[model samples]
Target: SVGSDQPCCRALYDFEPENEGELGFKEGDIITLTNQIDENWYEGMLHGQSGFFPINYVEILVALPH
Candidate 1:
C-alpha cells in the first residue's frame, strides 16, 4: 500500500502544520518536495520521514495530470 499513491511536489500554500490539514496526493502521481529528499524508505527524512499519499485527497488538476 505504501508508494501506491503519489509523491507530493508541493504542500498547500495556505497549509499550516497544526491545522490537521490534508495533503492533495493522487494515485500514480510523482512529485518532489523541496524540503524532503532521499526517496529511499530506510534512509530517513526531515521532519521525521518521507511518504507517499493516497489519491482520495487530491484534486487532480488539468495541468498536473497523473
Candidate 2:
C-alpha cells in the first residue's frame, strides 16, 4: 500500500514555526508521524520538511473509536 501502518495524523490546529528545527503545519495538513522528542512534542514530516510540534496538534488515524 501507499500509506503506512505506523501512526499518522492530520493537523487539528495550525502550528506556526518560530525557529529552525521545529516544523510548522496548517490545519488539515496530513502528517507522517515519527518519534516524540519530549513529553509535549512529537516529530512529523510534511511537504518534504521534518520537525517537531505539540502532541495535541494532531489527531491519529489509528485513534481508537467508540
Candidate 3:
C-alpha cells in the first residue's frame, strides 16, 4: 500500500503484539507509517506487514513544517 522509498521511521524499542492484526517489530526495524491512528498509536508497516504500534516506539525521520 506504499512505495519502497516512502517516508519511514526507525524502531526505537522492541514490540510484541498480543492480539491478532497487530504488528510485532523488533528494535532497529524500520517501519513505514501509513497514518497516525491517535496520540498513542500509529498504523505502520513492517516490511509489508501492517498493524498498530506505539508511537513512542519509533523515531520519525520526516521533517515537519514549522
Candidate 4:
C-alpha cells in the first residue's frame, strides 16, 4: 500500500523514546504516514516530528476516503 495512492492512518503499537531524535512516539499515538522507506520502515509524522519507524510497530486504523 506504500505507493497505492490510498490514504491511511496509523497508531503506534509500542512506546518509543521521546529523546530518540525525531523517531519518538508513545504507544497508541496516531501518526500520518508520508512515505515508505522500504519493506521494513516508513516515514511518518507524530507530534510535529517526522522520521522513520519500523513498519510493524504501527497498526493501520483506517484508509482515508478520497
Number of the top-ranking candidate, with lDDT as the measure: 2
Q: List the residue pairs that clash in candidate 4.
A: none
Q: Tell me how far the alpha carbon of residue 63 in candidate 3 is from the true structure, in angstroms, after superposition.
A: 5.9
Candidate 2, residues 1-66, lDDT tens digits: the string is 445675678999999998898889999998878777776888878988999888888887743222
- What global local distance difference test value does model 1 have? 0.30
Alpha carbon lDDT of each predicted model: 0.30, 0.81, 0.79, 0.67
The candidate maximizing TM-score is: 2
Estimate, for each residue in 1-66, the C-alpha lDDT of model 3 and write its tens digit.
555557678889899998887788999988877777677887877777889888888898752222
Q: How close is candidate 3 to the true structure, as a TM-score?
A: 0.80
Q: Kindly report which residue stretches of model 4 are placed more than 4 angstroms away from their true locations once superposed.
A: 1-8, 15-22, 62-66
Q: Which stretches of candidate 2 lie above 4 Å from their native place?
A: 63-66
lDDT of 4 by residue, 31-58 (tens): 7777776788777787668887877888
Worst ten in a row by lDDT for model 2 = 57-66
Instruction: Compare candidates 1 and 2 on TM-score and give the better one.
Output: 2
TM-score of each: 0.21, 0.81, 0.80, 0.64
lDDT of 1 by residue, 1-66 (tens): 434343333322232123232233334333343222223211111243344332222333222222
The residue-level lDDT of candidate 1 at 14 comes to 30
Cα lDDT for residue 10, model 4? 60
Estimate the lDDT of model 2.
Answer: 0.81
The reply for model 1, stretches above 4 Å from the true place, is 1-22, 37-66
